[model samples]
Target: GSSMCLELALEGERLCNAGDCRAGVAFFQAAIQAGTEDLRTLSAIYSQLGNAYFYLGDYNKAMQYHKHDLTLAKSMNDRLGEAKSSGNLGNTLKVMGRFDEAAICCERHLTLARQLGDRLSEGRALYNLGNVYHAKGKHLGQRNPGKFGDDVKEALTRAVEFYQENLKLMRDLGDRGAQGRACGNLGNTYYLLGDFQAAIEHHQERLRIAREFGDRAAERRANSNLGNSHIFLGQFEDAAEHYKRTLALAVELGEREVEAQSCYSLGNTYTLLHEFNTAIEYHNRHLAIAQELGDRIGEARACWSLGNAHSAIGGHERALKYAEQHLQLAXXXXXXXXXXXX
Candidate 1:
């Protein structure tokens, strides 16, 4: 009976992989009801369900499942599984703009990962910590109702440490995809540190690794990171080239979020070059995609970008309108703080 339940749970994982979330949910539920299960199996099923819920944008349910997984794994003395669940939950919380809570979760995960001597889990937890700090740092620089002070440099320093450690692990492990992820994270940390050259180098390395791993999505992200770095370094031509390349890849991958991000980056570069019309065009494209994808945060960022572009073009009234729209959306989403500088 236990074996049968475990088999059903395994099949549920396959169903989830095959993009049949509804079927996968049913199977997982059935396995749970079988009453012939171990805590590890229950944890695994809950983790899979959490991923499915995350994809469906049911963040609350996703979090619930992750919590279930974490509890069960801990009860089973499965430290590795507990660490993995904690890391995934932290990542989801980070995306939801809960940086402080995410940081705590990531820290706990990292501790457990180290205890278990799981290099992969350690690297993932480190990467998550970097993300948490990055988001918190960014949020600190915004003008919002509940404005908070943030030590951006301190946050970035922590992020750099995490990324650097993860990078070394990934390199030693010879995991190309993980290496690319670490490199990309390093680029972000370098950018925040105002080291554009180092940022570019890391992004280029990430792109190279992405190619080796046949990870088109990572390649696109790397290119976008490089473009942003070039823009900060006042290399408009190079920035434009990388942005174009990234945009193409984003389209090919059907990654609307990345495409929107590319558009925003391109718009920023064009604005710096005094290409007002082109900047507006790119920002508008970003806005369209964000709206279509129902990405509230992306839409807010697009509005902010559009406002900045309009301001550069002397459309003060329209610029204010877009700025207000950005603020409105951000407030509604409870994204009041600048996570970047905090």
Candidate 2:
């Protein structure tokens, strides 16, 4: 029974790593049902089950299983397991929008990782801490900019410091994957800080690493970030090229969300270039994908962009209709922050 359980768990790991997380959950559950007296194996199974739920976007189930793993680790005095479980919990809490709790979890993980002299785990914990601070900064920047603007900047700056430290550690460890991720995070932070040149440089490094590692997903993300920075710098031609590449990669990866985003970016670039018809075409594509996915925010953004493009082309009636639709969606969300761009 123990052998069967281990075999099932191993299969689950393979499926999850290959991006079939829902299918992985079934195998992990089967392993749990097969039953094993091996606590270490059981801990691994539970941790993987938690990770499957995380990839499936079920934050509640993810947290529950991670907590289970944490309990098991504590009972066995497995320090490394405890640290790993804390890190998992931190990531899940961050996705659940519990920044404060996430920070606590990451701090616990970081402390344990340092004590254990586990360089990989320590770097990962630091990365998680950086993400927590980055999220806090973004939240504050959006909700209460006037009073919390400086705090937002401070948090983001701290996040950058953490990322840089992690980057250094990753370099020392010769972990190219972690280095690429750290560079991507730094690029994003610099973009948010309006340091377009720095963002471009960091993202270029990320792109190079992604290519070297043959990680298509990472390459797509880096390209999208590059496109965003270029757009902000008014480099419409460069932005368009990067967005086109992003769209092609997203299509190849079957990532509808990224496809929609690339479409929106292309639409924005075309609009800025005064190519009204081309802008409308891309915006329409984005709107269709958003509607299909039931993404109200994406729909609102597409509608706003469509309205702007139509207005530029003197299609007053079409412009008014899209504008009304955008407003309606914005009102339903009750967070007109998206409309701020409009």
Candidate 3:
């Protein structure tokens, strides 16, 4: 049984490396059942299983398996494994929106890494904490903007500090990718804080890094973010310029979803500028792409708000009148979808 378990787990690792987590999971589960006597082997298997589930986007199972890894690592007094599992658990919880729980886990991970004198792991812990705090602040703002103003500000401020620290660490390690992403996240936090120029500066750092590395995806992302930065500055032309550049990059990269993202965002920009016809033109592009991809969420999002722009003036009365008559004449058409007409 022990020999078989070792063989199975090896195959699991091999399959995972080959990018087949579904098959990897089957092997790992079988390996677990067969059992391994060595604590080291058992712990490694558990870690692999946990990460496999994470890659599969099964965060619930990911949490469960990571907890298993942590518990086992604790039993063996394995500080490294314990630290790694704690970090993984926190990251999963963060994605699951359990900010409070994630914070505790991330804090523990950071403490453990510091005790172990592991700079790389410590940096990861810092970045995870930063993301957790940033997300908490964003959710608070969205749920009741201005109501939790101080709470939101405090969370975002904490995020900024953590990100800044992580940025320094990445620079010391000579990790350009980490530095670029850190800047991108810092820009997000500043954007939420209503400091558009500060956000722009961070985004500019990301843009420069991306250009330096020939990272087209990151460059496109920075352009999209830059457009967002311009929105509240009454810089509609500048926003459109950035958005247009983002669109061209997305198309050049053959990233259809991002192209549609550009489509909708550019459409909204035109609506803000009172160029209603141009707005519909861009939105229509999003509609076509969403339909072609059979993305229900994107398709649904495309449906509403089209009328609000065209109905910018006397068109509202005409729309209201037509909608009322249609509801009265074709009762089945009362599948109102709220008429989105309101």
TM-score of each: 0.70, 0.73, 0.83
As a whole number from 0 to 100, the lDDT of residue 167 in candidate 1 is: 85
By lDDT, the best candidate is 2
Provide the lowest-lDDT 10-residue window in model 2.
333-342
lDDT tens string, model 3, 1-342?
889999999999999999988999999999999987988888888889989998899999999988898899899999878988898889888888899999999998999999999999999999999999999999889989648589999999999999999999999999898999999999999999888998999999999999999999999999999999999777998898889999999999999999999999998999898888888788778878988998756665565545455466446654454445435433444336226556
Question: For residues 190-281, could you state the per-residue lDDT of candidate 2 as single tens digits?
Answer: 78777899899999999999999999999999999999999889899999999999999999999999999999989989988889899899
Q: List the residue pairs that clash in candidate 2.
A: none
Give me the overall lDDT of model 3. 0.87
Order of candidate numbers by lDDT, starting with the best: 2, 3, 1
Scored by TM-score, the top model is 3
Worst 10 residues of 3 by lDDT: 329-338
- Model 1 earns a TM-score of 0.70
For residue 153, model 2's alpha carbon misses the true position, in angstroms, by 2.2
Judged by whole-model lDDT over C-alpha atoms, candidate 2 comes out at 0.90
Regions more than 4 Å wrong, model 1: 1-4, 142-149, 247-342
Q: Where does candidate 3 stray beyond 4 Å?
A: 145-148, 274-280, 294-342
Determine the backbone clash count of candidate 2.
0
